[PDB]
Amino acid sequence: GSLTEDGLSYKEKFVVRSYEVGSNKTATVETIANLLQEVGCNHAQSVGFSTDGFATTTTMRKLHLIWVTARMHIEIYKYPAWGDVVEIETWCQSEGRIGTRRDWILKDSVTGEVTGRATSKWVMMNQDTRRLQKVSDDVRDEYLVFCPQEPRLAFPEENNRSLKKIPKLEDPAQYSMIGLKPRRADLDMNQHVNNVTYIGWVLESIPQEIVDTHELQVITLDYRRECQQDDVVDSLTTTTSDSQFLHLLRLSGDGQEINRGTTLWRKK
Amino acid sequence: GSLTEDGLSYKEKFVVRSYEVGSNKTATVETIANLLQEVGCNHAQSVGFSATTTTMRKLHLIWVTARMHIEIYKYPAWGDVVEIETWCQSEGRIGTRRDWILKDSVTGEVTGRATSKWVMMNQDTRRLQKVSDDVRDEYLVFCPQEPRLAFPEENNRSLKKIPKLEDPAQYSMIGLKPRRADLDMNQHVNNVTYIGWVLESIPQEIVDTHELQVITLDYRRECQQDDVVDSLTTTTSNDSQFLHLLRLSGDGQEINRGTTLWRKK
Ligand SMILES: CNc1nccc2ccccc12
Ligand SMILES: CNc1nccc2ccccc12
Numbered sequence: 001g002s003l004t005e006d007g008l009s010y011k012e013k014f015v016v017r018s019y020e021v022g023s024n025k026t027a028t029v030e031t032i033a034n035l036l037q038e039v040g041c042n043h044a045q046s047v048g049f050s051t052d053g054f055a056t057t058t059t060m061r062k063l064h065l066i067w068v069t070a071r072m073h074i075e076i077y078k079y080p081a082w083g084d085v086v087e088i089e090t091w092c093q094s095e096g097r098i099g100t101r102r103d104w105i106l107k108d109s110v111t112g113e114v115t116g117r118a119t120s121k122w123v124m125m126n127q128d129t130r131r132l133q134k135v136s137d138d139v140r141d142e143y144l145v146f147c148p149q150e151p152r153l154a155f156p157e158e159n160n161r162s163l164k165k166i167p168k169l170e171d172p173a174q175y176s177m178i179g180l181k182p183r184r185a186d187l188d189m190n191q192h193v194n195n196v197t198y199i200g201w202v203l204e205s206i207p208q209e210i211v212d213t214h215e216l217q218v219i220t221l222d223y224r225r226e227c228q229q230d231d232v233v234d235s236l237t238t239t240t241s242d243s244q245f246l247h248l249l250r251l252s253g254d255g256q257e258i259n260r261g262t263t264l265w266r267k268k
Numbered sequence: 269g270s271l272t273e274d275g276l277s278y279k280e281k282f283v284v285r286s287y288e289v290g291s292n293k294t295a296t297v298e299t300i301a302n303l304l305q306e307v308g309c310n311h312a313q314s315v316g317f318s319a320t321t322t323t324m325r326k327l328h329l330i331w332v333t334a335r336m337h338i339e340i341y342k343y344p345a346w347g348d349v350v351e352i353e354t355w356c357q358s359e360g361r362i363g364t365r366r367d368w369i370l371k372d373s374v375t376g377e378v379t380g381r382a383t384s385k386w387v388m389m390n391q392d393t394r395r396l397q398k399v400s401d402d403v404r405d406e407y408l409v410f411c412p413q414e415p416r417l418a419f420p421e422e423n424n425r426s427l428k429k430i431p432k433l434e435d436p437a438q439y440s441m442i443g444l445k446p447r448r449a450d451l452d453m454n455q456h457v458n459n460v461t462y463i464g465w466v467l468e469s470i471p472q473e474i475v476d477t478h479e480l481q482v483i484t485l486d487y488r489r490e491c492q493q494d495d496v497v498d499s500l501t502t503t504t505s506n507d508s509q510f511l512h513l514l515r516l517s518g519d520g521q522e523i524n525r526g527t528t529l530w531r532k533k
Binding site for chain 2: 017083204
């Protein structure tokens with residue numbers, strides 16, 4: 001992989017692996033989400049930031065501050081096949097004091113056509129107290145020299161799906177998958193549950209018949225609270241409709257919300 | 269990746285990814301096991317298999333893993349390039365063997381090695397069978413004729429008999445279930461998931477202060493998509509050794525048995 005000519009974005013190619021594909025012999029949405037995080041990490045390393053998933057700067061490290069995902073939005077037009085080469089371009093933008101945004105464009109390497117796009121909202125948090133804060137001038141200036149100055153959006157359209165408000169699923173859920181627990185392979189290098197695991201847990205409550213006859217086109221996921229290594233999760237889904245669903249991940253015991261989301265599926 | 273000059277083995281390079289590493293910023297044993305299966309699949313494609321032969325496909329026959337044995341001397345770091353060479357050998361009518369050698373691409377030194385035993389099974393009835401001459405001849409032209417072993421030693425760890433863990437287990441992890449990411453392209457639980465489930469019953473203190481050196485895993489029965497598994501471990505031992513058992517949560521039906529060897533960091 002490499003930073004582009006102007007140094008304001010990063011590109012990387014990936015060959016889709018045999019264990020990365022589902023029943024249609026094309027990459028799963030979790031494989032796509034892992035590749036998005038991999039190219040994001042390689043972009044941060046290339047410009048001298050922390051590589052542990054937090055993309056931390058000098059002044060953030062001293063203050064015990066980290067970047068955490070608030071929302072992930074992914075739209076796939078065509079899933080790359082096993083053995084195919086996918087090219088992913090990524091860039092970051094400051095969103096004033098609110099936080100940062102990381103965007104991605106996925107392309108078929110052979111044809112050059114756009115096969116997918118993604119966007120993510122990140123907020124600043126103290127890693128110890130878990131308290132959120134606005135972005136200071138000191139931190140904005142340090143990130144701004146690595147971001148395009150004019151707006152560059154993967155989702156430019158007015159009132160697009162990436163900015164919609166997600167409601168809270170009401171009991172009873174139409175479908176559920178209970179007792180979901182992370183194993184060591186679900187953890188990152190910091191022993192925290194990887195953000196992609198939550199995407200998998202959301203999808204666990206979609207019936208197998210939908211998965212077998214439909215393709216996932218859009219997924220929007222809000223992150224409210226983290227699942228700890230010894231926590232247990234319940235995944236809930238209700239049809240709201242193409243097939244659309246409303247999703248809720250909550251702790252198995254007290255019912256504490258960890259995530260909420262929506263998915264849109266197209267008939268094969 | 270590519271077949272080597274003589275066409276009897278296959279090599280491929282991999283750059284270790286950020287999500288593929290553990291707490292020490294080096295590849296997990298499950299990442300290694302996934303790379304081993306990926307290079308095995310690329311070797312099969314390069315010589316025209318899909319790893320069934322023409323005779324196997326009409327008879328509804330498949331190769332299934334009976335045992336996996338992996339030894340790691342040094343886990344590759346995040347961002348490091350690892351080179352893996354793999355080859356197959358026929359073991360008469362018993363089945364086949366796939367071997368691997370892992371090397372650090374920069375230094376060229378051997379950082380790991382692995383071996384696996386495969387048996388022929390009817391896809392539908394799940395009945396095992398001896399390898400016929402028709403199948404044997406079809407794959408022999410893709411294998412070295414003289415023996416080539418990743419584990420040549422006289423009394424090596426890859427061929428040891430594994431006993432059945434006796435209740436009560438010293439440690440356990442209960443209620444393990446596969447999710448869709450644990451399934452392969454055929455909707456079967458990926459062989460690497462079982463390695464993860466075995467390791468789930470090792471205490472976090474061992475993982476935090478030791479490095480996994482050797483893992484030997486026998487495959488007896490498959491975990492179905494709607495099955496639930498219990499992972500059991502008992503210490504058998506500067507080095508720590510454990511005996512492992514995976515069994516179905518309900519009836520206690522054995523699915524796997526294994527052993528692990530860990531060295532102090
Ligand atoms: C995936 N990592 C994380 N997600 C949420 C909150 C976190 C707080 C501290 C360190 C890591 C965190
Ligand atoms: C990982 N795949 C498998 N493991 C065991 C038995 C199997 C039987 C039929 C098809 C696939 C099988």
